[PDB]
Amino acid sequence: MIVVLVDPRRPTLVPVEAIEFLRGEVQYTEEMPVAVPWSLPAARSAHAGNDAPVLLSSDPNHPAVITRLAAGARLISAPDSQRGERLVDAVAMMDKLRTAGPWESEQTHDSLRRYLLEETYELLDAVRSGSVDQLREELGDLLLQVLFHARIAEDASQSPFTIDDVADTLMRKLGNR
Amino acid sequence: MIVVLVDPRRPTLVPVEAIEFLRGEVQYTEEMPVAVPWSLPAADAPVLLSSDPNHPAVITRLAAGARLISAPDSQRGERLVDAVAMMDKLRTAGPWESEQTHDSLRRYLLEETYELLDAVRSGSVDQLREELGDLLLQVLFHARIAEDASQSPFTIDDVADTLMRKLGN
Ligand SMILES: [Mg+2]
Ligand SMILES: [Mg+2]
């Protein structure tokens, strides 16, 4: 009857419109964090029992979600993700590979200064080649440099900063203009 | 009694741990969207709903022993989505930025990357962080220009996806 889709990057928060429908019998999909069944008193898994009048999930592709939606269940959904949230996914993967990476762990600002001027020229070649499918790839290569130098400046022993401070630096500079 | 503090960027989302408590009388602070009290069909109060940790009512009630049920803190990099939004506004409201193309931006790509190298071999952390934002701007600018493309547009999220697929291998 009702399908509740939450933000996958905040699967622990629910849309305010759904809380009355969340205190009864609900089913949660298997990718929901363990925090949800411990907060919802009378909830259970979507592979347990018969179908519940409301199913709580974060995966729009999950078969049960597609099932009940096709059968005319009403959807109560969290707002769509905002432009640039995969970027937050990106800095997390940069943080992960910085520690686990043998090479990536010992690299510093000077050991990266060599690569930067190369990747700029490859981006200039992409622009002049007119092909959209590698302007995008080299654009990623330049973003990788910005996230690497930023993750390194965290390990800074004097005046260390993060990717959130450079974003503040950029925004504060566009504001005086 | 209870303070429920929500993510200011995602103000209609409540922690699951607070569902039990938004049933009776509830108070909301001024910055909350008007839509939120309208969505709690079950409408001095024991429960205060807010998005502002520096609100006076939140501070006093927490200091008085109220229990806090808060949305998780922001992850490293959420300020990048603010930067994308500000890049989007200036692409549409700034006359000069509204005309820029991939070719016309080429000029300042080489200028700022050289300045970043100048900051690395200078030691200055305040200039390293500044020239990092200048280079970051170019990536957001080029990605935003791609969104307007008539042929095969992409966005900053797409280039973020492409970096990760390459990062996976
Ligand atoms: Mg390359
Ligand atoms: Mg500069």
Residue numbers in the entry:
A (entry chain B): 1 to 177
B (entry chain A): 1 to 43, 51 to 176
Question: How does the study describe this entry?
Answer:
The Mycobacterium tuberculosis MazG (Mtb-MazG) contributes to antibiotic resistance in response to oxidative or nitrosative stress under dormancy, making it a promising target for treating TB in latent infection patients. As a housecleaning enzyme, MazG functions at the cell nucleotide metabolism by degrading the non-canonical NTPs, preventing mutagenesis and DNA damage. Mtb-MazG mainly contains three domains, an extra N-terminal region (NE, residues 1–85) that is absent in other bacterial homologs, the N-terminal domain (NTD, residues 86–253), and the C-terminal domain.
There are six MazG molecules in an asymmetrical unit with a cell dimension of 109 × 109 × 242 Å, which includes two monomers and two dimers consisting of two identical chains. The Mtb-MazG (1–185) monomer contained eight α-helices and five β-stands, comprising two globular domains, including a primary three-layered α/β/α sandwich domain (named domain 1) and an entirely α-helices-composed domain (named domain 2). Domain 2 included five α-helices (α4, α5, α6, α7, and α8), which showed a higher B-factor than that in domain 1, indicating this region exhibited more flexibility. The two domains were connected with a short linker (Ala78-Gly84). In the MazG (1–185) structure, one magnesium ion was present per subunit. The Mg2+ was coordinated by three glutamate residues (Glu119, Glu122, and Glu138) and one aspartate (Asp141). Also, the NTP-PPase activity was significantly lowered for the mutants of E119A, E122A, E138A, and D141A.
